[PDB]
Predict the 3D structure of the following.
Amino acid sequence: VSALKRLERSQWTDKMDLRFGFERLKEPGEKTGWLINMHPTEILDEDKRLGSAVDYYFIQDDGSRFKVALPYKPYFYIATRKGCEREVSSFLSKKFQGKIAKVETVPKEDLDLPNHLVGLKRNYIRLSFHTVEDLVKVRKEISPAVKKNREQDDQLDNIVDMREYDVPYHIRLSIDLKIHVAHWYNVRYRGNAFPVEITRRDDLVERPDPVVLAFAIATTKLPLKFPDAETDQIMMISYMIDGQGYLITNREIVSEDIEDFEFTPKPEYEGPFCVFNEPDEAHLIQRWFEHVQETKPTIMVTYNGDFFDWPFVEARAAVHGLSMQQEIGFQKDSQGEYKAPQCIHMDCLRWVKRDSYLPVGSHNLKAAAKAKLGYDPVELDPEDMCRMATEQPQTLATYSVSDAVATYYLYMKYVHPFIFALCTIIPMEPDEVLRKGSGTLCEALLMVQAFHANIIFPNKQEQEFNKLTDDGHVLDSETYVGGHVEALESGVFRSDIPCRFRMNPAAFDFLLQRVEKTLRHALEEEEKVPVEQVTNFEEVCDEIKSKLASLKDVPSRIECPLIYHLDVGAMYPNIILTNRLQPSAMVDEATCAACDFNKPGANCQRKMAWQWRGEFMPASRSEYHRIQHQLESEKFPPLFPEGPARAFHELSREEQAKYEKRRLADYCRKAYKKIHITKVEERLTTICQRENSFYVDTVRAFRDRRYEFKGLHKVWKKKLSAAVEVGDAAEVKRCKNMEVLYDSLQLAHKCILNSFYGYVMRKGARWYSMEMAGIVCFTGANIITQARELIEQIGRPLELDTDGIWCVLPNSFPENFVFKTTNVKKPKVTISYPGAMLNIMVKEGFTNDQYQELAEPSSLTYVTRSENSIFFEVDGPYLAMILPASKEEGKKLKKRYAVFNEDGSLAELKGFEVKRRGELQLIKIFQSSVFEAFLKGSTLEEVYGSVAKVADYWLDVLYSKAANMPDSELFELISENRSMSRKLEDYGEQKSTSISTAKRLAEFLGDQMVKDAGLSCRYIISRKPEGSPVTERAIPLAIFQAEPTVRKHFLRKWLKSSSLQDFDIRAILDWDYYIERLGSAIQKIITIPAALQQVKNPVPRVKHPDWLHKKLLEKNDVYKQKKISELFTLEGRRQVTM
Amino acid sequence: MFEARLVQGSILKKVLEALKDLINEACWDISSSGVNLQSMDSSHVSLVQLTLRSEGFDTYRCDRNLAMGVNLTSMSKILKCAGNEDIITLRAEDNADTLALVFEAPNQEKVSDYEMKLMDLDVEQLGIPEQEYSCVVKMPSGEFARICRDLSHIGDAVVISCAKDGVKFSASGELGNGNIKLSQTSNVDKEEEAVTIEMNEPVQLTFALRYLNFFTKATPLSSTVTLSMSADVPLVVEYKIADMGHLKYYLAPKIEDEEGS
Amino acid sequence: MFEARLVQGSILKKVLEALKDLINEACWDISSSGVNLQSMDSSHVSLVQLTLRSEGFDTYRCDRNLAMGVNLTSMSKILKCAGNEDIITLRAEDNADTLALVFEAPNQEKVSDYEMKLMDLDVEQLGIPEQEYSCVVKMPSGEFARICRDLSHIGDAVVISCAKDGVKFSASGELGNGNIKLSQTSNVDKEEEAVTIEMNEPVQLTFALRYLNFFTKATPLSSTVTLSMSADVPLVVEYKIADMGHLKYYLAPKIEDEEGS
Amino acid sequence: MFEARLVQGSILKKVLEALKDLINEACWDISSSGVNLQSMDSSHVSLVQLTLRSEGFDTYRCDRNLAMGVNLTSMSKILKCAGNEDIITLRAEDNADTLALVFEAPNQEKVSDYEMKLMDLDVEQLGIPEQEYSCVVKMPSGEFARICRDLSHIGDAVVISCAKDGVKFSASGELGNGNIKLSQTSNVDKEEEAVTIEMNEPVQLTFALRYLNFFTKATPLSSTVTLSMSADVPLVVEYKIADMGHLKYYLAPKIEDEEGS
DNA sequence: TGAAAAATCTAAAGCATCACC
DNA sequence: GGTGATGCTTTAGATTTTTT
Ligand code: SF4
């Protein structure tokens, strides 16, 4: 970018800063502030030299706002050979005069240096510039030639490798100066020549309320297409400012005026309104823009406004004589986002998508409103509102302002404290934090922690294409072992029905021999309470001995089961803390030998294995050499259109790797008859326990901080309850603010702790190790598998999860105990026995003993300790657990179950109400109804009879006709809505069904539905064109409400029939495919699990699959089989030898 | 050192394709009196008895008793190469773990020796007791194979009954049931395709036709086969082969549990 | 009490082999005139009529008009079990839900009686009147099946012409196309190979070639076929089955309604 | 007006079914001396050279060197789809991109013509050289097909070695290793069971069995197959299409350059 | 931001059938 | 009457999209 344009760019953003309540601080004085935004701009200094800087925007507690510019000269580090640092530094100084300003040698601790523990540091060279474009220029000048030279293994060749080129500028400032969003500051100024100084203030923490805005768009459209920015008109913008609502309405489309109306969904929520009616759209946009000018906000909020609101309004401002930049300040960036120089843009969809932990298909609105806010906003589909806007505007206004208030309170209650709790520890702007994924958040935390430890940052690694494992066999997958997610058995397990069990007396003898030790460990480690002052220890030991013996003497019982959730909370961070794994600590034997700590009898090594899965071509290395040599004298089509001929040597790595992979794949798919080979081998690697602990130290710090903030959140929550029991406005406000702050910090720490494990496996990460994820996942698999071996011995497990076990235990097996304790602070102690049992199992199995830490760096003395935070926390006895079954042998449904709370509500329900893709709206209401009504019953037969009876409703309605009940809601009872993003033309290669019904509807009304994208795709499947697959029998409902002669003609033409005279909608539909769908659902949910648990068919209208039918015939028959082992007497045993 | 030679190479192909489907790993017992097989299937429902006496082979010699374990599926897979006529020679060594198969052309043009490396295994070997069987019937292999493949399509249970007029093959299932009665052929010129029965006590006892179909594919071994049964004992199906030896299969019955009343 | 017998029972096996895939459910009709079947196929696009008169069975007894409840894919499994020279002796008692057919070996040594349970259904019956048709071709059955398989390999539809020079079988697909001419043969008097065509006027009409090749599998039951075809009339694919009955096929023509006109 | 009538159609169907799964699409060069096919396969390691001379055709008429680009799958399914005993004929237009075929039955009963489109492609005709080969062997097609399917069925690579005693085919694998040796005979006056050896210089080289199976799929084309190899020159699996043309094959040596261990 | 559920193409393997010595 | 061989059927595996 030319300076002769960026100078007026910076002048323009300075003007816009001046006209939105911000002012650059010029008077030398100290004033408090609150950082809310960073923006890398340009600041001309006092000596007419171009200088890049940052723009720290602040607000204050009184309403006044300002900003401060910090000029910090950017830099990166380069590393050169020993004995040549000063020469290359002087050569760069005398080669880029005017670009390079200051260069010096700086010692910093490389993290992968050989023999680095005793104090070796590699001398680095840091060069500083004035502007960011000079960084880009010198980087593009020096990087590619030198990285090719290094990977191959004039005086610029003496350098080897540079670091943190990819770090953005504002992140670099936020690291070097410790300037995080949502903190109070004392900014002091002296003059232009004197650099400005900033200090952090911590004696107060109370967050102010920035001026906030939240608007939503409702628009009409031509029927059944995606709305465009030129055919229809905006008619109602509804926006919220600090709990007060304003609505601006275009009077051309709506019918009459609008009056003020209260809109409160619940007494907690406030919906006041002062509506305003305007003549035309230009006056609406002018009034809205001027009202934004009047309010002058720093933060504002849209719900999916990046892709639906702002491009639309920007296009219409551009067409109707304005330009969107110079009046508000929002514009399109190269990355397709909408940032403002003065305002921060929030998108609630990104938060729901990334951190809300909702099901994937419930990411859109009304779902985060019924799940998080607690109420269902008033809705109507976009097809109806176009016609609704003509006659009455009450429903349209209600929907628009309901969307506005839902967006506003969804942001303010949850998203705002959460994101402004992340930004206290993340060194990025709030929109930067909310925009991109958890990977860069964790990367920024490791960035700041590595900078406090003075550690160089590794480059984002090159994604090495076509890697060779041992004897060639180039890979298309480099993966660790998948998670062990299964469902051991299917059916119902309620806490009232009797259930079968199979004890092992040896297991109960083992459990009996050590009850005292398990209670020792439970009292000493779980609560850090010394055991020598509890009084009723003998009584509870006698009680548990009596229960265990009375259950032992009959190792076969049918009693009521107690469902437990033996899971380990924060399991993967617990593993990485206990085993002390760091992504640059695990080192193979090829370098530990060069390490001087390779002494026999030491504990620098810990061995853990993992299952590496590798999928590759069967072509050997020689085949790869032949194919790369043969791919040397051929032409390729140009990458750009109308380009010249492209040879092989000048091709980029990506395209040549793709083409060579395609050539190998085509050579393989005809020659070696096996395209892919998946090979799993055990790999064992050494994890150095003697490392500069910043990673695991960070994880430990976040876990301790999370527990501390949970404690402070609980104590401030009981302060909140006392405060609402006394009722004074100031103190309830203060305690509410502090409680929300502590809760948001708690959730932020929990999210970061959950994302540490997910970060390291991600491609391109600075600290990349697939061995990390493999080792931690395999250790978790080992813990889970020993847990399920023990639960198999003592009871029965039900579901297999990455960090949880579900199980049923006999009711006579002990559950929990109460202890009398002489401690005045902790007089009552409760311990659940299965938790203690699993805890002592993992204590004797998985405790690290080589867990070593620094003591003092001067004498190199290392204190060896032993820690194990792996804890099976348990959940209460649930009322029921449901495992629906699959339809095929060998494959069992993974993470598809339902758990019920004690009171009869829903505890968990996963894998069913996700609606990941478009569904039929024919199985969701069925499964919801059966789960709701499923609880009533006494035995297995009674509960299956009840669920069969409630399923007979849907089976009778779908299998028979609609009958007496009205036909109004039947169309939406079966209709499935589908949509596509691109045009109809570029999808013409495939057939599918969506473009097929798009073409079917194109021949009805016109070709205008082809030139656009995203239309209605109703799927009422027809019957009478039999033999044709469903892809051709897809007709929409647009022809049902059309003209009668037109629909007669098109029903005769489309479905290749002419003689038939019945054109009713109650005959066109194919009841057989609908019954097949509902029956497949009922096989998944009810009938197959009923047949698995030794119970006959609950409903006789559904036919079992062939495998289950033949299993039931061979089982129910009194003729099972006989063997030969007992029918003939065994002779003996001998084995074949050499 | 072990040497064997068959004047007719078709019988080795036929025994390998007969024992291909039932088991996967076998254990040849090689003796100077003959070679035998007592391997056991993975389902533990059927056992294979094999006898091939020494005097059938053109050349046969054994220095001592040898026990080697071969992958029988791959054994039949490699033997399917050899033609229906070529001379098959077996060569083994007491200091080697590789069994050799030399094939000889009828008109002395081609030789084809193959090397198969064996493996160790742990299998059960079960002693078979000898008892007199109540009902004995011989039957041509073709029509018994047709009967078995016929009744396989009805259901999964076959009932073997011996009445005064002859043997009766029942089979029930979801498709109803179906019966096959056979009579006594006395005024027949040749007993190779004929049937004859002898009785001690009538008995009804059921078998599963999956393993019986597995036994069915030994039909080309010889045109005749004898099956016999008694109270709570398996069948003995003797596919005796041209005085080289015989081959037998044992299939578990089940006692008639009470279901009628 | 109803029963029947057939000296050459392979024709029943062959017609069930033909009908096992076109029809899944059909209600048999048993009358004093003989056996006849009237039903609609699975896709409801073609209705088949079968007729074997009383003289086809050497021993026929039918005292009342009664109808079976046979499903075809079930007893097609148990009718294919016979040999090509067996004897079929069907039997059915009036109050029984299940009919039993007894098999007889060609040289009379064994009996194989199988009974198949029936579900009672009710399907509407329609009587297509006889009409004189414009064209009737005396095409050999083998050549008709060959040309159907030939044309079905290119495209999904075929048009049939009967010009004054012969009949024209042409099909056009997305990949290729072509036309086949069958010239009249009068130099050879044998009807097994020569063709004679009834000539009234040329007719162009499109049929579902996929379904035509679907039910061309009935070929070996008759030596020659006759295609009776009229304008906007379903074609009558006649098979003179053995020497006593006929196999009536009616496939409804399809008409394309293109949007160009 | 490219016309090529040949009184037999079986040989063209066989030589076209030879290129079923080997070359998906190729260029059909027409010249006054006949038709040629030079084409690289999808994996770009083997070669095909088919020549059908003009004099071998019954009647032949060409006017100008014209090259087509029809894919092998479409024309192969078209030609194999029709009959085999009939008479083939070619028909083409000067500027059109469509070939035509004529199937005239020898008994003057029916005619059958199909015509299909093509795709335009003008890949360079590789100027392969002809060199004197180290050894030449002539053996019947049947036993060569047998041993190739053998060694693809038992292993992956074959070492073909030629000496004075004949030729050997040593194949190894994860299951074992064996070889097949053939000896020349001269007392047999017919070549249907006789093999011949040309001995100039012995050579050992390793090939792949998938390509050998793909080539020797063309076994009904000729009763004899001739092989020739050198130190680094590929094989020549030459075929003799009656007395009308020849179809060759080439395989680059399987270099392995393995570590010496 | 992806990546795996489901549909759809696709080739290998077994089976009854076809003509000949 | 057996037997090499082939069209037909089945069945497991490769492929491909989207969720806006
Ligand atoms: S594992 Fe031991 S030898 Fe290897 S780097 Fe660590 S301390 Fe040094």
Observations:
- The two ends of chain B are 63 Å apart (CA to CA).
